Ligand SMILES: O=P(O)(O)OC[C@H]1C[C@H](OP(=O)(O)OP(=O)(O)O)[C@H](O)[C@@H]1O
Ligand SMILES: O=P(O)(O)OC[C@H]1C[C@H](OP(=O)(O)OP(=O)(O)O)[C@H](O)[C@@H]1O
Ligand SMILES: Nc1nc2[nH]cnc2c(=O)[nH]1
Ligand SMILES: Nc1nc2[nH]cnc2c(=O)[nH]1
Ligand SMILES: [Mg+2]
């Protein structure tokens with residue numbers, strides 16, 4: 001079962017999150033967790049009017065029951081006065097790592113499953129563990145055959 | 151409170167309803183309830199491959215009386231009657247009367263009008279206004295600042 | 296070669312067409328050519344406030360170099376005071392047939408190719424003959440694999 | 446003139462056509478997105494090309510430029526992306542900072558078209574490009590009341 005997320009819906013959720021992050025003066029900038037948090041971070045930057053947008057690149061490859069993660073690029077700092085945004089939190093593996101790198105940052109996401117829900121400071125939509133979130137950047141408008149060939 | 155429905159999502163729901171109407175060979179045609187059922191009817195017609203698409207136009211006049219501007223012929227046997235949603239089921243009662251043998255379906259359905267439909271896709275609260283795609287558009291929205 | 300038409304864009308064109316059809320008081324109703332003109336007709340009906348929407352169902356069948364036309368259902372009258380709308384005109388084969396059924400009707404479409412262009416009373420977008428118009432109702436938002444497996 | 450409307454779907458289509466030109470992907474070390482216009486396009490290229498190293502370059506006006514933050518290096522092996530190039534004001538500044546970088550944009554106007562290595566859509570000098578992140582689906586009253 002999949003939870004389809006179109007661009008329009010994502011933008012709606014992002015604006016709802018931005019309204020909570022007001023005022024925008026309390027924020028020095030935004031730290032987007034590449035690559036998923038890039039689009040939501042761009043949207044928050046637009047709504048809050050933040051021009052200082054940085055990133056934290058962390059690749060993770062699962063090997064059976066253990067994860068091998070490495071920070072390809074890291075934003076200098078502790079996240080003091082910064083908003084760390086990611087598209088979603090599933091198991092919370094990434095969230096835990098991010099919180100250790102930027103403990104003084106306001107960690108937020110758009111979607112949050114039950115596992116990673118206690119790790120984020122704020123989120124917008126609740127999604128089940130068994131439900132797979134299909135993001136807009138992974139989809140596209142293409143031809144789809146009729147249910148029937150009548 | 152409001153419930154926003156984009157074209158993409160409406161089509162996703164239409165395709166789910168279309169799958170439940172299979173096989174398409176059991177249907178003679180589709181009667182769309184103007185104007186709400188026009189788009190959903192067009193989507194079903196595409197998915198099921200039904201080319202016989204007709205319409206039923208109803209207008210409103212102490213009491214609120216119904217007025218049939220245009221009507222599709224028949225009692226609805228072998229036809230699908232489609233409307234975008236059922237709130238209280240006022241218009242739903244009128245359609246049921248005209249096409250008793252038809253398979254009345256909608257995309258959305260609120261608690262009050264839920265019993266009047268043969269099938270629907272999404273449940274919506276009674277107090278929630280469903281904002282359909284044909285009433286919206288992509289325009290400039292000022293930053294929250 | 297192809298031309299992609301999203302729901303948003305189709306609606307933009309439909310609203311532009313509705314503007315030229317004003318005032319709406321001069322129209323008795325709308326006759327949509329199923330199935331292509333169904334969505335465009337619905338949009339016009341909403342924009343113009345027309346509640347009288349009817350249809351004309353004509354089935355085609357290409358048998359080599361000749362067409363087999365069969366009218367499944369048709370609106371009454373000659374289209375006097377009515378707006379007959381279809382999504383597009385390619386060769387103009389359908390347009391000719393419809394114009395002969397409703398001679399007093401204002402025939403309009405959203406898209407128009409050079410061949411059928413002279414057959415309509417009004418249209419919105421010019422499309423080349425070699426270009427295939429991909430309508431929204433034939434498409435859908437689904438997963439699309441990355442251009443590379445990096 | 447008038448306004449060139451760009452929806453999310455269309456922007457993504459242009460982004461994919463650009464991505465196919467930047468192949469192979471192995472020739473790139475990373476992507477430098479120009480804040481804030483190149484953030485979304487940069488995210489789409491990163492997904493299509495499979496590049497996980499994405500940095501940013503933030504510039505503010507006051508005109509003389511001001512670098513709020515800048516990515517490291519001369520941009521050798523990197524792709525610098527912005528959503529568009531109008532006159533090339535900010536483009537000239539990017540060239541100076543990341544000389545050995547491959548500068549690309551989605552849209553390009555006559556005046557700024559030379560200052561970029563590659564783009565996808567040509568837009569007139571007097572036409573205002575309305576980006577998706579500045580718009581939203583809201584209720585739009587019917588043309589006729
Ligand atoms: O909660 P976790 O189980 O730790 O995973 C959630 C992560 C991973 C996924 O990104 P990736 O799958 O890492 O890929 P991408 O870089 O494209 O975002 C998603 O966008 C979040 O950042
Ligand atoms: O200019 P022509 O070459 O005559 O074709 C243009 C017609 C045919 C096509 O519909 P169909 O292919 O007939 O199917 P549908 O009922 O789904 O619109 C399109 O929507 C126009 O109505
Ligand atoms: N797109 C996507 N990526 C993920 N990575 C981990 N969980 C998810 C999910 O639900 N969706
Ligand atoms: N979708 C679609 N249907 C057509 N039927 C004839 N020409 C066309 C076209 O270009 N697009
Ligand atoms: Mg991620």
Ligand SMILES: [Mg+2]
Nearest residue numbers: 328329330331
């Ligand atoms: Mg047709």
